Design a binder for this molecule. Structure first.
Ligand code: SWN
Length: 279
């Protein structure tokens, strides 16, 4: 660690959590191993307030080159915070640690699929509006997510949705062993991603919300999706999805990227749909 470049060490000081400020429960994993090496932890802020956090161990990092790159991703991610985006609490330098807020309800897809939970149509549109707000923020920063889906959004104790799976929180489902159906048509054809291809993914995420986590295009092979979309076939209107909300989804799947709504337009249109419900 003494081999680290000093101007880079100075640069990362506002992101670094001192080892005396973090208590990691290496004996308690979060999510039964489904999210890899992530543990319960306790972060002590400057005032001594105890913060329940999720601590990911980055075992895939060994050399000083990978360590430096990890410090930079930390510096960049610390500048991203919004109520609807998973916010980095900090980093710790065993293996390097990524400290994230604790999300009581885990991923959005498993929450809406859980038979014991009963989110209303209002609550579901509300989750889609929160995702649109988080994406509007990421898009304003010229950030292209590339993997927006309900599995990649987290839900906290106050039912606030956090767009995740970016920066140091990427490869969320990295399991140790012993997304073509969300992609825009041009991304399937050219392998190039833009904010307008994230708008497409957003439309598929809206459809996941309104069907309470059903898998998209279950009868279509991942190889056959391109042709299916070129024929002008699209995901159908879910049973209890309001028509103006389905109109919004169809706009997200326009074959011409330039004709799709912006995330700013999506927040505007969805906020007005959301306001029609009693609460
Ligand atoms: C890297 C990047 C992002 C993560 C995601 C993550 C960050 N903070 C979390 N806080 C809690 C949980 C989580 C997982 N499952 N659960 C619950 C679900 C309801 N039943 C009890 C368990 C909570 C996940 C995360 C991980 C690694």
């Amino acid at each position: 660690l003494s081999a680290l470049n000093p101007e880079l060490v100075q640069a990362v000081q506002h992101v670094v959590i001192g080892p005396s400020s973090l208590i990691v429960h290496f004996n308690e994993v979060i999510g039964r191993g489904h999210f890899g090496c992530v543990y319960h932890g306790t972060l002590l802020d400057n005032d001594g307030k105890k913060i329940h956090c999720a601590v990911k161990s980055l075992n895939r990092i060994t050399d000083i080159g990978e360590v430096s790159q990890f410090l930079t991703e930390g510096i960049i991610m610390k500048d991203f915070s919004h109520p609807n985006v998973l916010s980095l609490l900090g980093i710790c330098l065993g293996s390097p640690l990524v400290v994230l807020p604790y999300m009581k309800h885990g991923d959005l897809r498993n929450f809406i699929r859980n038979e014991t939970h009963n989110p209303t149509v209002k609550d579901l549109i509300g989750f889609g509006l929160q995702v649109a707000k988080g994406m509007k923020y990421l898009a304003s920063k010229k950030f292209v997510h590339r993997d927006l889906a309900a599995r990649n959004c987290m839900l906290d104790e106050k039912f606030t949705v956090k767009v995740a799976d970016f920066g140091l929180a990427r490869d969320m489902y990295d399991k140790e062993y012993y997304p073509v159906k969300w992609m825009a048509l041009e991304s399937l054809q050219t392998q190039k991603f833009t904010t307008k291809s994230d708008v497409w993914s957003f439309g598929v995420l809206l459809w996941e919300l309104m069907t309470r986590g059903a898998p998209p295009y279950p009868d279509v092979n991942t190889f056959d999706i391109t042709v299916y979309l070129l024929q002008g076939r699209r995901l159908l209107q879910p049973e209890y999805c309001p028509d103006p909300l389905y109109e919004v989804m169809l706009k997200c799947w326009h074959p011409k990227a330039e004709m799709r709504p912006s995330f700013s337009e999506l927040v505007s249109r969805i906020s007005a749909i959301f306001s029609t419900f009693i609460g």
